[PDB]
Every structure is written in structure tokens, then in C-alpha cells.
Amino acid sequence: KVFGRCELAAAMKRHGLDNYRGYSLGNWVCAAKFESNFNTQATNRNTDGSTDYGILQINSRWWCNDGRTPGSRNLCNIPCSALLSSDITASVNCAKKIVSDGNGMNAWVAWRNRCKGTDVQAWIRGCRL
Ligand SMILES: [Cl-]
Ligand code: NA
Ligand code: NA
């Protein structure tokens, strides 16, 4: 599924991401835009052999099991394919564990490089939330 911007903002809010660990909703929408272009089916392979999955590009070396990342942890205890669903619940629940692990949203490279320090509220402007 490819979300609209406000559609995704509304889904993220319903799932408790607004101000989760202090990160306003616009931060999450901005991260999703640049990680996946709002596409739940996005995948990208990394140089170390791990793969990133879904709207928030969650990595198989630490967070989910894709059966082909040796020595990987499965800290969200989910198959990585569950992160590609049109229902974002599994991605959101895993993202909550990631953002609580110490480094906050800096875990998402695109957030650090393209959202951090910008006016992220623009990502939810105009939306009926
Ligand atoms: Cl980047
Ligand atoms: Na893909
Ligand atoms: Na992989």
C-alpha cells in the first residue's frame, strides 16, 4: 500500500506515535517519506547482507527475522515480511521498541539526515487529525 501523507499521519496517530518518546507526529511522517516514500512494500538490501523492510525500513540484522541474515537478532520477534503489510501495526510496534533503545530516532539514517532540525510540522499541515 502507498499511503497518502495525511492518511499515514492519521494511522500513526491512532497507533500512538504522536509524541511517542517525545517525537512529534511530523517526525514520524517525515521519516516514512524519506525511508520508503510511504510504500509499505519497500525493501532495500544493505552491504552487510541485511535487508530493510517496510514503511520505516526496519533492519533484519537486529529487529526482524527474514531467514537470510546470519547471526541476526530478532528483537521485535516478528518475521520481516510482517512489516510489509498494508496494516502498519507491526511496523509501529517495532518502531516503538527501536526508538526506546537509547539513540532515539537517530536510528533512522534518513530521519537524521533529512528530517532532524527541519520544520517537521509541515508534514502534517492541512491534515484532519
Ligand atoms: Cl540519508
Ligand atoms: Na520491495
Ligand atoms: Na537480508
Curated annotation (Swiss-Prot):
<dbReference type="Pfam" id="PF00062">
    <property type="entry name" value="Lys"/>
</dbReference>
<dbReference type="InterPro" id="IPR001916">
    <property type="entry name" value="Glyco_hydro_22"/>
</dbReference>
<keyword id="KW-0929">Antimicrobial</keyword>
<dbReference type="InterPro" id="IPR019799">
    <property type="entry name" value="Glyco_hydro_22_CS"/>
</dbReference>
<dbReference type="InterPro" id="IPR023346">
    <property type="entry name" value="Lysozyme-like_dom_sf"/>
</dbReference>
<dbReference type="GO" id="GO:0005783">
    <property type="term" value="C:endoplasmic reticulum"/>
</dbReference>
<feature type="disulfide bond">
    <location>
        <begin position="64"/>
        <end position="80"/>
    </location>
</feature>
<keyword id="KW-0020">Allergen</keyword>
<feature type="active site">
    <location>
        <position position="35"/>
    </location>
</feature>
<keyword id="KW-0378">Hydrolase</keyword>
<comment type="similarity">
    <text>Belongs to the glycosyl hydrolase 22 family.</text>
</comment>
<dbReference type="GO" id="GO:0005737">
    <property type="term" value="C:cytoplasm"/>
</dbReference>
<dbReference type="GO" id="GO:0016231">
    <property type="term" value="F:beta-N-acetylglucosaminidase activity"/>
</dbReference>
<protein>
    <recommendedName>
        <fullName>Lysozyme C</fullName>
        <ecNumber>3.2.1.17</ecNumber>
    </recommendedName>
</protein>
<dbReference type="GO" id="GO:0050829">
    <property type="term" value="P:defense response to Gram-negative bacterium"/>
</dbReference>
<comment type="function">
    <text>Lysozymes have primarily a bacteriolytic function; those in tissues and body fluids are associated with the monocyte-macrophage system and enhance the activity of immunoagents. Has bacteriolytic activity against M.luteus.</text>
</comment>
<dbReference type="GO" id="GO:0031640">
    <property type="term" value="P:killing of cells of another organism"/>
</dbReference>
<dbReference type="GO" id="GO:0003796">
    <property type="term" value="F:lysozyme activity"/>
</dbReference>
<dbReference type="GO" id="GO:0050830">
    <property type="term" value="P:defense response to Gram-positive bacterium"/>
</dbReference>
<feature type="binding site">
    <location>
        <position position="101"/>
    </location>
    <ligand>
        <name>substrate</name>
    </ligand>
</feature>
<keyword id="KW-0081">Bacteriolytic enzyme</keyword>
<keyword id="KW-1015">Disulfide bond</keyword>
<dbReference type="GO" id="GO:0042742">
    <property type="term" value="P:defense response to bacterium"/>
</dbReference>
<feature type="disulfide bond">
    <location>
        <begin position="30"/>
        <end position="115"/>
    </location>
</feature>
<dbReference type="GO" id="GO:0042802">
    <property type="term" value="F:identical protein binding"/>
</dbReference>
<keyword id="KW-0326">Glycosidase</keyword>
<feature type="active site">
    <location>
        <position position="52"/>
    </location>
</feature>
<dbReference type="GO" id="GO:0005615">
    <property type="term" value="C:extracellular space"/>
</dbReference>
<keyword id="KW-0964">Secreted</keyword>
<feature type="disulfide bond">
    <location>
        <begin position="76"/>
        <end position="94"/>
    </location>
</feature>
<keyword id="KW-0732">Signal</keyword>
<feature type="disulfide bond">
    <location>
        <begin position="6"/>
        <end position="127"/>
    </location>
</feature>
<comment type="subunit">
    <text>Monomer.</text>
</comment>
<dbReference type="InterPro" id="IPR000974">
    <property type="entry name" value="Glyco_hydro_22_lys"/>
</dbReference>
<dbReference type="GO" id="GO:0016998">
    <property type="term" value="P:cell wall macromolecule catabolic process"/>
</dbReference>
<feature type="domain" description="C-type lysozyme">
    <location>
        <begin position="1"/>
        <end position="129"/>
    </location>
</feature>
